[PDB]
Design an enzyme around this catalytic site. Structure first.
Site, mmCIF file in Angstrom:
data_model
loop_
_atom_site.group_PDB
_atom_site.id
_atom_site.type_symbol
_atom_site.label_atom_id
_atom_site.label_comp_id
_atom_site.label_asym_id
_atom_site.label_seq_id
_atom_site.Cartn_x
_atom_site.Cartn_y
_atom_site.Cartn_z
ATOM 1 C CD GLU A 1 -4.097 -0.174 -3.604
ATOM 2 O OE1 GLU A 1 -4.556 -1.162 -2.975
ATOM 3 O OE2 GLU A 1 -2.946 0.280 -3.422
HETATM 4 N N1 LIG Z 1 -0.944 -1.301 -2.472
HETATM 5 C C1 LIG Z 1 0.011 -0.750 -3.274
HETATM 6 C C2 LIG Z 1 0.428 0.556 -2.979
HETATM 7 O O1 LIG Z 1 -0.102 1.253 -1.946
HETATM 8 C C3 LIG Z 1 1.389 1.163 -3.750
HETATM 9 C C4 LIG Z 1 1.955 0.493 -4.838
HETATM 10 C C5 LIG Z 1 2.975 1.170 -5.670
HETATM 11 C C6 LIG Z 1 3.849 2.108 -5.132
HETATM 12 C C7 LIG Z 1 4.777 2.756 -5.940
HETATM 13 C C8 LIG Z 1 4.818 2.503 -7.296
HETATM 14 C C9 LIG Z 1 3.925 1.598 -7.847
HETATM 15 O O2 LIG Z 1 3.936 1.339 -9.186
HETATM 16 C C10 LIG Z 1 2.997 0.950 -7.051
HETATM 17 C C11 LIG Z 1 1.553 -0.814 -5.108
HETATM 18 C C12 LIG Z 1 0.580 -1.460 -4.362
HETATM 19 C C13 LIG Z 1 0.198 -2.876 -4.724
HETATM 20 O O3 LIG Z 1 -0.796 -3.376 -4.178
HETATM 21 O O4 LIG Z 1 0.900 -3.470 -5.571
#
Ligand SMILES: Nc1c(O)cc(-c2cccc(O)c2)cc1C(=O)O
Ligand SMILES: Nc1c(O)cc(-c2cccc(O)c2)cc1C(=O)O
EC number: 5.3.3.17
Lengths: 279, 279
Positions: B46
């Protein structure tokens, strides 16, 4: 203790186009295990490290993906040469690698290196011998030109499409492509001087690559062998359009198939960012 | 015209441990299409962007993977809070997100933010209902505790192993795991206050994740529901050991299963690098 780096978009003149590489300067104090961890931290397709030369060149370059060291790589070396041009005045740059010393010609405007040309390793090639399987994975029935696999470090397969629109329409089955180990699949279309390419490689960790510099030399050889250009004629290869990372590669293969004397690949590069890491 | 950024290793106090996130400051001039292209250029799991608040918080944070925007994410928000602490004096930080305002407590030594604690969204959960398939993919015959899938934005499945050595011995079939869409698979083992985890998620683009901050809150709830800790007791979760990215996450779930009042996740963070991009 600290290292400066730059992010170069290779095979582009505009940031966010081309193919990124991170270049770390003054890296002699980093053991290779630490270079590998840094490359993993950055998570770019490659990070390169600039070291003192050992065999008479200007610098020794070590090339790492997030997982392993590479002996050669196309766009990472182009981007490294363009980055290092900010620190030298020489018109030619000789970069040592695991595979020997690669000669670059640097092109400047008012001291800024905007492009470079590299002599590449001379490829070898043979028939892939898996045509039906590969064509099914790509979703088409046949290639235009023979399906051949070239080796210049990496391995690059070439599949020809009858038009640029047919190339853009490809939607490969990437699960099926993953059965093609230790290679990249390059699909191409065009005519005359101007060609379009798309590259897919589960083996090299990329769904679709923006600018496959190590495939540009081989493609020039492929097009010349199969009568679409002559040996000694340069081609312009535009890659990455469909994925929003347009990249222009120029390539030329001199000699004849049986006695290739030079394989040149050139492109623009541009700095996306500059920074410093804490180790 | 230019933007400064930092790379924070979240859930670590030592660079090259934990889970990286790139944080871009003063991003109000970037349309979201450009934020997405920058996140793609960086290729970290991210990149986050710091914007002026719209609902009374200290800042609005937008979170992008290389391919899409996320409404919430664990380690990226922890790292953003720690990064922004370099620019504020406040002990508490209120970060607006798509899902509302997340409260952070910042921990400093001589002005440097070394750790933070975040209140997380309260998860929901149910049985996965695909146990035999998932266990076969992981290469084991059974879970210790019930195989349940939690939702707090992302979805996180928990599979329990009988010992830390059994957890380290897992060699999942990642092709088989790719049939588990829109979720991450978290395998855990331990006792008392101290737990170990490994996370695998083809759906979220990671073979094995170093520090899955959004799974730490759910794991605390899972352990409390299944009688291994009490509600209100904090746990230490060590993730990423097998892949050389050890990460320590602390988590606590207050209340009872039917009326959870707070889910807290905390960790250290450290700056790996700092730089400036040209747009
Ligand atoms: N690394 C992540 C990632 O790739 C995707 C998501 C995610 C996926 C679907 C819905 C949402 O709200 C979040 C979360 C994270 C994290 O780090 O929490
Ligand atoms: N991006 C690349 C990549 O991931 C791998 C390789 C490669 C693979 C095997 C042997 C070798 O010498 C090189 C080359 C490149 C490139 O850019 O040229």
């Amino acid at each position: 203790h600290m290292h400066n780096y730059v992010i170069i978009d290779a095979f582009a003149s505009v940031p966010l186009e081309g193919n990124p590489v991170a270049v770390f300067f003054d890296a002699d104090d980093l053991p290779p295990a630490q270079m590998q961890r840094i490359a993993r931290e950055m998570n770019l397709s490659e990070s390169t490290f600039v070291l003192k030369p050992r065999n008479g060149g200007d610098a020794l370059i070590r090339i790492f993906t997030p997982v392993n060291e590479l002996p050669f790589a196309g766009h990472p070396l182009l981007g490294t040469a363009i980055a290092l041009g900010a620190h030298t005045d020489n018109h030619r740059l000789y970069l040592e690698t695991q595979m020997g010393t690669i000669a670059f010609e640097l092109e400047r405007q008012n001291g800024s290196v905007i492009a470079a040309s590299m002599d590449q390793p001379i490829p070898t090639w043979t028939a892939l011998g898996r045509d039906a399987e590969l064509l099914k994975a790509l979703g088409i029935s046949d290639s235009t030109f023979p399906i051949e696999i070239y080796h210049n470090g990496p391995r690059h397969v070439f599949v020809g499409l009858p038009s640029i629109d047919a190339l853009s329409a490809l939607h490969p089955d990437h699960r099926a492509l993953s059965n093609f180990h230790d290679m990249a699949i390059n699909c191409f279309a065009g005519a005359g001087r101007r060609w379009r390419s798309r590259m897919f490689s589960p083996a090299y960790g990329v769904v679709e690559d923006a600018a496959t510099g190590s495939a540009a030399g081989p493609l020039a050889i492929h097009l010349a062998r199969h009568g679409q250009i002559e040996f000694g004629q340069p081609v312009e290869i535009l890659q990455g359009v469909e994925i929003g990372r347009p990249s222009l590669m120029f390539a030329k293969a001199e000699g004849r198939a049986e006695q290739l004397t030079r394989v040149e690949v050139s492109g623009n590069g541009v700095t996306f960012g500059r920074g410093t890491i804490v180790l």
